[PDB]
């Protein structure tokens, strides 16, 4: 079952892993935010709200194999707040839908 | 070369709108383009990461675009591009 909204984390991300995420097209998303957190072991904290419904395999293809991804929960704005809670954003793109 | 540009596209194709929307997140520090319009119209603002000049920008945004170097605050061009309030693309953050 594909869903539209995914959350995801990446502990200790490589720079090639950072560029894979930033190299995504702006059109993939209604809303996209990934903050950097932690620097005793920095992890990425990301929430993606895709335009189309996406499948696990497709969310992993886009973000990276090493990401831990699962269906998101809560309002768009709620996860925006969760992802920008250490105040070091890497990517924001779009606007939070309902 | 400059980093900050402004552009319009008069009556812009669906293939022209998805060409602009298809662009990488990693090209811009700020990027906004709203739709305005009886003759609809695309008003944008691109604050790249790298310095780019004309022929680079027009390979990215689209040939028949009307581009030029920007002037005003980034939150000024943001207010300009969202005056009509129908946003197509916002990506990054309005810088210094």
The experimental technique used to determine this model is X-ray
Q: Which two tokens stand for residue B57?
A: 């920008």
Where is chain A broken, named by the residue before each break, C–N > 2.5 Å?
38
Mutation for B interface: A26, A32, A48, A50, most B CBs within 10 A: A26
First to last CA, chain A: 21
Q: Which two tokens stand for residue B14?
A: 């669906």
Residues A70, A4: Cα–Cα separation, whole Å: 11
Mutation for A interface: B25, B44, B88, most A CBs within 10 A: B25
Say how many CA atoms lie within 13 Å of B24 toward its Cβ: 12
Q: Which two tokens stand for residue A68?
A: 């831990």
Q: Which two tokens stand for residue A83?
A: 């992802």
Name which of A17, A49, A20, A44 is nearest A32 in CA terms.
A49
Secondary structure (H, E, C), chain A? CCEEEEEEEEECCCHHHHHHHHCCEHHHEEEEEEEEECCCCCEEEEEEEEEEEECHHHHHHHHCCCCEEEECCCCHHHHHHHHCCCCCEEEEEECCCC
Q: Which two tokens stand for residue B30?
A: 């700020």
Query: So what's the architecture of B1-96 in CATH?
Result: 3-Layer(aba) Sandwich (3.40)
Residues B77, B45: Cα–Cα separation, whole Å: 7
Burial label, A54 (beta-carbon count in 10 A; 0-12, 13-18, 19+)? buried
Residues 14-43 of chain B whose Cβ lies under 8 A from any Cβ of chain A = 18, 21-26, 31
Contact residues for B39 (Cβ-Cβ < 8 A; gap 6+): B10, B11
**Residue pair A48/A78 in contact by the 8 Å Cβ criterion:** no
Q: Which two tokens stand for residue A98?
A: 């309902």
Q: What is the resolution of this structure in A?
A: 2.7
Query: So what's the architecture of A1-98 in CATH?
Result: 3-Layer(aba) Sandwich (3.40)
Domain coordinates in residue numbering, chain B: 1-96
Alpha helices in chain B (DSSP H): 14-21, 54-60, 74-81
**Residue pair A20/A91 in contact by the 8 Å Cβ criterion:** no
Instruction: Say which residue the tokens 């953050």 belong to.
Output: B93
Q: Which two tokens stand for residue B87?
A: 């946003």
Contact residues for A53 (Cβ-Cβ < 8 A; gap 6+): A2, A3, A4
Tell me the chain A residues in contact with residue B18 when contact means C-beta distances shorter than 8 Å.
Answer: 27
Q: How many CB atoms lie within 10 A of CB A18?
A: 18
User: Is A91 touching B (CB cutoff 8 A)?
Assistant: yes
At B77, is the secondary structure helix, strand, or coil?
A: helix
Q: Which two tokens stand for residue B35?
A: 């739709």
Residues B25, B22: Cα–Cα separation, whole Å: 9
**Long-range contacts (CB closer than 8 Å, 24 or more residues apart) made by B49-57:** B49/B3, B50/B3, B51/B1, B51/B2, B51/B3, B52/B1, B52/B2, B52/B3, B52/B5, B53/B1, B53/B2, B57/B5, B57/B7
Positive/negative CA dihedral, B8, B14, B15, B19: positive
């Amino acid at each position: 079952q594909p869903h539209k909204r995914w959350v995801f984390t990446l502990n200790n991300p490589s720079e090639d892993e950072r560029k894979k995420i930033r190299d995504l097209p702006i059109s993939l998303f209604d809303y996209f935010i990934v903050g950097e957190e932690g620097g005793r072991t920095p992890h990425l904290q990301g929430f993606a709200n895709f335009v189309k419904k996406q499948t696990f395999n497709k969310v992993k293809w886009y973000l990276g194999a090493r990401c831990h991804i699962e269906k998101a929960k809560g309002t768009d704005q709620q996860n925006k707040e969760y992802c920008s809670k250490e105040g070091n954003l890497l990517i924001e793109c779009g606007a939070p839908r309902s």
